[PDB]
């Protein structure tokens, strides 16, 4: 005897968006490359770093990326692109 079985009601899931950090600290980067994909600003933008229509951080100039902790109780993260600054 099988006795019959009930029915499940929740078996739905969405595609996983590949968010998170893309360029790590110290890595050289050119303008227009993605540095951080997020839903809501988890990492604030600094100098030479822009914002998009999806809160995506992208570079605005050549240089080395650099994360700096700031804000109350050092709970806010900020990214920047420190220009090559070769300056001979």
């Amino acid at each position: 005897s099988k006795k019959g079985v009930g029915s499940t009601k929740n078996g739905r899931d969405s595609h996983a968006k590949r968010l998170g950090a893309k360029k790590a600290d110290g890595q050289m980067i050119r303008t227009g490359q993605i540095i951080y994909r997020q839903r809501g600003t988890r990492v604030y933008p600094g100098v030479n770093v822009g914002l998009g229509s999806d809160d995506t951080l992208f570079a605005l100039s050549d240089g080395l990326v650099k994360y700096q902790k700031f804000g109350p109780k050092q709970g806010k993260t900020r990214v920047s692109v420190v220009k090559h600054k070769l300056d001979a």
């Binding site: 005897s1 099988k2 006795k3 079985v5 009930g6 029915s7 499940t8 009601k9």
Partner: protein
């Protein structure tokens, strides 16, 4: 039968009893206590049996505290049912007892009755119990 009045989620993941002792490790309300030596899942039915046992073997002035509480529920699929078609329905509530958690404590009656009272409470529970006193 101790039971939470409401829960946010009917079917939660089971909580492991393997590990050391997180909280409820030292007698802090009474001065004699029933410590566990083997982590296990014990349900509200065992609490009620143990609590009723203590109360029957208590006196007219003894006072007791129940530390552990059956927060987490467990399910059980109905009999003769093949695997699939979702999780079963909640059946019984169990308190998670780890190795070293003080379950029952007693005070305000002489030592022999308290030692005997903790013995009958621990014979109602699956965990291997042991008696401890309160630090001065």
């Amino acid at each position: 039968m101790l039971q939470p009045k409401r829960t946010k989620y009917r079917k939660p993941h089971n909580v492991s009893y393997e590990g050391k002792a997180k909280g409820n490790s030292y007698v802090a309300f009474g001065e004699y206590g029933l410590v566990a030596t083997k982590g296990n899942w014990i349900d509200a039915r065992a609490i009620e049996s143990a609590r009723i046992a203590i109360s029957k073997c208590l006196g007219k002035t003894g006072k007791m505290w129940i530390r552990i509480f059956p927060h987490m529920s467990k399910t059980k699929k109905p009999l003769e049912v093949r695997m699939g078609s979702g999780k079963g329905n909640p059946e019984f509530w169990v308190a998670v007892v780890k190795q070293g958690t003080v379950m029952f404590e007693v005070a305000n009656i002489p030592e022999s009755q308290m030692i005997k009272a903790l013995t009958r409470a621990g014979h109602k529970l699956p965990v291997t119990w042991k008696i401890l006193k309160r630090e001065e």
